[PDB]
Design a protein around this ligand. Structure first.
Ligand SMILES: CNC(=O)c1cccc2cc[nH]c12
Length: 171
């Protein structure tokens, strides 16, 4: 089997416990913490592209009320984010397996934007997800992995100061 783990899941779990928030901006704000993925069971000599995207974990708009997050009362079906291609893509099994795969450069925006940046729906909750796409071979293949530990709400500003505190402590 191809095996796909989360690096620094303990760091991530400290945020999940509080309800994680990622800042989103006109031009795009990078993520903290950064999604880092351990990957074994690739073909060292095969070709893979690493895709990242962001599934609306539910169909609700969220709001900060009496110091806690709660869902609105009007679900819209959510489209998944556009895909961000890891820049080491495409690359050999052995590249992706030799060190953790960092998506340190992904930028999250809330605006109708040019390129690079991934536009998210403000105040919706997102599950990060990666697609390992085997390329070059005669048969294209996809393996997808979601990361519950890395769930967050897209915010223009931090609401829970406890999150802000953690973001500065571990940055
Ligand atoms: C119903 N609308 C949407 O699903 C939507 C809106 C704005 C940004 C994103 C990113 C992914 N989906 C989005």
């Amino acid at each position: 089997e191809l095996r796909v783990g989360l690096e620094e899941s303990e760091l991530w779990l400290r945020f999940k416990e509080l309800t994680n928030e990622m800042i989103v901006t006109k031009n795009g704000r990078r993520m903290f913490p950064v999604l880092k993925v351990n990957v074994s069971g690739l073909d060292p000599n095969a070709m893979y592209s690493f895709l990242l995207d962001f599934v609306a974990a539910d169909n609700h708009r969220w709001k900060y009320v009496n110091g806690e997050w709660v869902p609105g009362g009007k679900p819209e079906p959510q489209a998944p984010s556009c895909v961000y291609i890891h820049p080491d893509s495409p690359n050999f099994g052995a590249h992706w397996m030799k060190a953790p795969v960092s998506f340190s450069k992904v930028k999250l925006t809330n605006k109708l934007n040019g390129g690079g940046q991934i536009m998210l729906n403000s105040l919706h909750k997102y599950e990060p997800r990666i697609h390992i796409v085997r390329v070059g071979g005669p048969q294209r293949m996809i393996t997808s992995h979601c990361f519950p530990e890395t769930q967050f709400i897209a915010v223009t500003a931090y609401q829970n100061e406890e999150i802000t505190a953690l973001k500065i402590k571990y940055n």
